[PDB]
Symmetry: C3
Subunit: 299 residues, 3 copies
């Protein structure tokens, strides 16, 4: 008799998380009067100030943005900003009385093989899928990086895109992002540490400002010094203006040893334009320290 027994379930993560996952409506005004729904999507309430993360593609060209909570409350939202490269956008609502927020543990380290649920709220019940973390993502902002997504075999679709990816404790692991283009059975999410970083940037600047040094190049035992060889230098770029030349060997950027081309470019992307930084190079078996003014990455 199974009357006595308890079914295997992830319902606990759902109870803790789902209340913070909202419906997001993109509404157009036809010139008739009338209000019609252009598209629908999911979003996640990040804190008690009423900031919400959703997908950019859900809110593009909205005349009015409406947010609906599982508890019945309906709000008009303000668009704070968005980013095409990560397909994220931030909204703000003004709420009296408390808001449910997504559980976030900043100390939690995501592990490959961890169980995850992808929680949507397309029509408001909710659409929820289960899978594991297939690959952890990087949290870099360099525009050319392909590795800044968490991968999962939990199904990511129009139902749950823009909603929350959580572990079995209901802690946020990422923001679901539908792929418009990769292996069958693999979906993607923005890692939660990258998503909060992007939110903070949108809140202060209204957009994600990426740093640029204008250099292409590739990496060269412990007794050999690692570095990045300069393959090409962008005309009228920061490096070119500072006197950096092809075949230079970059051993240091802004006081950080340059041992990896990928790490150093994510490093530069975080540096605010107008910043003046030292870059140490090896040329003709001599050390040169050059002063470089960072610019904004070209569109």
């Amino acid at each position: 008799d199974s009357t006595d027994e308890t079914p295997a379930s992830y319902n606990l993560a759902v109870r803790r998380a789902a209340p913070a996952v909202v419906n997001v409506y993109n509404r157009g005004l036809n010139t008739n009067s009338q209000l019609e729904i252009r598209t629908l999507g999911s979003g996640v309430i990040m804190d008690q100030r009423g900031y919400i993360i959703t997908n950019k593609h859900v809110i593009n060209d909205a005349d009015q943005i409406i947010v609906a909570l599982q508890d019945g409350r309906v709000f008009e939202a303000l668009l704070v900003g968005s980013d095409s490269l990560t397909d994220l956008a931030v909204l703000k609502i003004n709420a009296t009385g408390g808001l449910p927020t997504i559980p976030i543990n900043a100390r939690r380290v995501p592990h490959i093989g961890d169980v995850v649920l992808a929680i949507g709220n397309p029509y408001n019940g909710q659409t929820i899928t289960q899978g594991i973390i297939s690959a952890t993502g990087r949290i870099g902002l360099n525009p050319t990086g392909r590795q800044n997504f968490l991968q999962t075999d939990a199904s990511i679709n129009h139902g749950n895109s823009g909603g929350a990816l959580v572990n079995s404790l209901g802690e946020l692991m990422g923001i679901n992002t539908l792929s418009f283009d990769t292996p069958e059975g693999i979906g993607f999410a923005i890692p939660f540490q990258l998503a909060t970083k992007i939110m903070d940037k949108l809140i202060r600047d209204g957009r994600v400002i990426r740093g640029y040094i204008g250099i292409g190049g590739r990496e060269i035992g412990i007794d050999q010094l690692q570095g990045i060889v300069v393959n090409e230098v962008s005309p009228d770029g920061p490096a070119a203006n500072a006197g950096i030349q092809v075949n230079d060997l970059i051993i240091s950027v802004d006081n950080k040893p340059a041992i990896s081309a990928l790490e150093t470019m994510d490093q530069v992307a975080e540096i605010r334009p107008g910043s003046v930084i030292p870059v140490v190079v090896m040329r003709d078996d001599k050390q040169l320290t050059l002063q470089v003014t960072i610019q904004e990455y070209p569109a």
Copy 2:
């Protein structure tokens, strides 16, 4: 050393449930002699009288219906009836000696996030998939309702369609129904409480008879009385014949307060044609009680 350890497994649910999941063969007689297989599918033994649920689309246009059990027994089946809207059909076999039956717990409440296995028997080994309950279904019979399906990311395919969806205890959560048309990675099943209701109806009437009041309309703090405003009234329908008019406010149907358009229409669908029921409306700030004879929903 893993010699000592025990692999994570749902094999227990399989052992309890799978013996009641059968092969169903649709066989045509070409005029040659010969017996050929038109299509194959899964079915579920519901009780010891030998009643079986399968998909209608598996048994359509069968000259002969054959059922095969995991234990080797082969039976000829009688078609009791079917329903296009839920794609269910009921069969009956005459068996001497016991039959294996699907475990059913009528006290069990399905929860979103519960683990489920979708069990098929396409060729007789079996084809089994794993997922969770994404959304619980309604058990309504109103023909226009879209919400009467349980949703799951367990894979539902030609292998397991018509078979059993069970939790990790082997208890029946639904009947697998392949979608012929929704978000990628989502399949559907008839919730088990709706499936048993449909079976009981087919057994007594040979078809699912749905009640009809012939009314379109939408719902209007606790101090305000909820109701359904009548948008349109069907000509020569039950409501029209009873004297119900547009802009009437329906506050009560068959002694049940009408607070939701969806609940009241599922309510009417369960009422047998020929039934005479009271319907209370508000017209011109006055209460009117009208006597309505329910009819059968038009095809």
Copy 3:
């Protein structure tokens, strides 16, 4: 507070298994100098001698085969042999110092419903998916058998094809094989006992040599003797040459009672060509013992 709690995870199986799952590169030499990558895939280190299993379709037409380990080591591989029917190939590398190997428990019985992870290493992080065993496979080598694959709803794709399928203990359940052609949501792997058998055969003969008796036919209470009726006999085949005729009833092959057409054909496939075996038949209610020289299955 979830700070104290532990997320549900299969990370243990990943830690035990993943280090033995390698990147396999198929490289062509264009006549320029240059070395270019024709295709990429996964492979599994089977033992400390440096034998590796991958897919045949990954190494077809390679000018050079390169293997890369999660720990950073890169090797040139020798192709030992392959088999089209199972899409397996074996490689060998020469390594100084230890190699990580896949955990194998030959005593472990795979069960339907067991949790499995499909581990790939397409670019070297790794691509990992989760599912269950849907159906256990046969380990037969008869070329016409359709049942020699393990089935799983763990996603099998270009990422993880040729890599390892393991249970939650990290024990090898099979080798992932991408299907180029079956129900949606079902993938396939070579059962691990069949995969090791194929590897041993490739190592001694350089190819999989299958036995052939040249007979078509089908099986006829315990008091009735089971047998295989001969439907057809191949001209100039082993059976024809030995004097076996249509309507003969095969009751014994190589001293094994013939109670199943499927079992007896897998039995014959394992017998080495040139072998002379007894085959007992019933003809005209008399027993005849015939001496048959096994041949190699025609391409």
